[PDB]
């Protein structure tokens, strides 16, 4: 029978470790070898999170080191912790594998989005059809506000583009933006190539850049602390992990250079819109231009449906007149 498993743990933690161990579909010696070799193929964020959440405790390590009987009498959990205690700097190796996989995940997460945000700022500073379209909106608004204090102006802010769909006609179906695009479909079609410049401003950030920047800075700080602990550790851990740490710190330093470039382009976009930089001129401008591009394409689609319905109504009227 042998029920005396001499397990120093309780039931729940040994239960969760027996849940955790059985998904590897192999012996715990292979698990201890993969910890010692630093192999990150089978070790994603969640597995190493569960492994750090099922760490051995101080009295558990003391009872394992005071165990003087036969090691086959132990359970698989206590034998796995003895294999884990056999690895020198095992928690350091687990933290290196977790931080390397998490650093690769956060870098592949943030860096194309940060390149999208930088390309969005570069296309918002330099846009081709945007001054001609803003001059047309300015001339139409100066005709519309003739005789009021808002009229006879030489410009407007970027929040006016959100307010274009607020003004509607007598029918309350064709807006100001819909009428301007119905006129621009006939006269100046190059303004319909406005989203091709705004396609890198399309989809915005969609995120808070301070959240990913604080996560990137905290990950870089954790990588620096980890590289300092590996530099205090043995040379096997150094030859295992120092090149990966150096590549991760170098890529996050390139990410911080990219974030400083986004700050410089944010100040340039604040000076572009003639607004102070103390207000949010970064995420509000991305959300404003994303909503402007979505309303622009929706005005194109609704004017297309309006012209198709008018042509189908003309065809139905001609077919009723012929019959």
């Amino acid at each position: 029978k042998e029920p005396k498993e001499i397990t120093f743990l309780d039931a729940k933690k040994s239960l969760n470790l027996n849940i955790f161990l059985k998904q590897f579909k192999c012996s715990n010696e292979e698990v201890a070898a993969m910890i010692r070799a630093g192999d990150t193929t089978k070790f994603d964020v969640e597995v190493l999170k569960q492994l750090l959440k099922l760490l051995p405790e101080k009295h558990e390590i003391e009872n394992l080191r005071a165990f003087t009987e036969e090691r086959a009498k132990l359970a698989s959990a206590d034998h796995f912790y003895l294999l884990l205690l056999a690895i020198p700097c095992y928690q350091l190796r687990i933290e290196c594998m977790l931080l390397c996989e998490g650093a690769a995940a956060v870098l592949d997460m943030v860096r194309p989005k940060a390149q999208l945000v930088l390309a969005a700022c570069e296309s918002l500073l330099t846009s081709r059809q945007l001054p001609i379209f803003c001059q047309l909106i300015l001339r139409i608004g100066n005709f519309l506000n003739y005789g009021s204090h808002t009229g006879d102006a030489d410009g407007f802010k970027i929040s006016t583009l959100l307010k274009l769909t607020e003004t509607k006609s007598q029918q309350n179906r064709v807006t100001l933006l819909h009428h301007v695009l119905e006129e621009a479909e006939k006269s100046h079609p190059d303004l319909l190539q406005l989203p091709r410049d705004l396609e890198q401003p399309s989809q915005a950030a969609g995120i808070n850049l301070e959240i990913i920047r604080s996560e990137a800075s905290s990950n870089l700080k954790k990588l620096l602390e980890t590289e300092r602990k590996v530099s205090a550790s043995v040379a096997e851990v150094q030859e295992q992990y120092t090149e990966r740490l150096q590549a991760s710190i170098s890529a996050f330093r390139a990410l911080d250079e990219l974030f400083e470039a986004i700050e410089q382009k944010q100040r340039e976009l604040a000076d572009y819109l003639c607004e102070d930089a103390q207000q949010l001129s970064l995420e509000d401008t991305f959300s404003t231009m994303k909503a402007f591009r979505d309303l622009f394409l929706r005005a194109l689609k609704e004017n297309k449906d309006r012209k198709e319905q008018a042509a189908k109504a003309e065809r139905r009227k001609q077919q009723l007149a012929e019959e």
Binding site: L15, A105, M109, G206, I207, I211
Partner: protein, 185 residues
């Protein structure tokens, strides 16, 4: 219902098993329903022939993906409710914000109904459309998912701490068939 568009009538219970075998063999989840419908309307590349046990051969086209599209668009049968990706996103948004990042990267799909060979990329696309671009979206799709509940039961069978959790005959005689409510969740 939609196999009568081409003229293959099925009214009996054995015909339900035949169409169930057709659904298990031929049907698949489309990645984009409008492009697949336009392609099936344009060219007859997706048309596949099935041989019935009497010897007759039928051929179906767009209905290979129109049947699992009811999983994403439940208004096909008039079941007016959200899609299963929308059901998943509303179940995620019912949770705390602290644990949402864990659930975004741990989307396990079980059951044989999720054994269509297009479901993971479409499900990741729909969740990634529904969720913001903050957190990692990862769909867990094991190949052995159809028996996985049984497999998990076998995982729960041989464990050492499950012996106290067994509902005995004596506990059944003591508490009726009602200790399963207070013991199991």
């Amino acid at each position: 219902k939609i196999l009568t568009e081409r003229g293959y009538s099925f009214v009996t219970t054995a015909e339900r098993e035949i169409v169930r075998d057709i659904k298990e063999k031929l049907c698949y989840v489309a990645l984009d329903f409008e492009n697949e419908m336009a392609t099936a309307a344009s060219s007859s590349s997706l048309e596949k022939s099935y041989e019935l046990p009497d010897g007759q051969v039928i051929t179906i086209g767009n209905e290979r993906f129109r049947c699992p599209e009811t999983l994403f668009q439940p208004s096909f049968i008039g079941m007016e409710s959200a899609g299963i990706h929308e059901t998943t996103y509303n179940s995620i948004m019912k949770c705390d914000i602290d644990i949402r990042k864990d659930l975004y990267a741990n989307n396990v799909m079980s059951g044989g109904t999720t054994m269509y060979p297009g479901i993971a990329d479409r499900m990741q696309k729909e969740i990634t459309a529904l969720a913001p671009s903050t957190m990692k979206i990862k769909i867990i799709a094991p190949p052995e998912r159809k028996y996985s509940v049984w497999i998990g039961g076998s995982i729960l069978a041989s464990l050492s701490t499950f012996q106290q959790m067994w509902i005995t005959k004596q506990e059944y005689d003591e508490a009726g068939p009602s200790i399963v409510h207070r013991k199991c969740f």
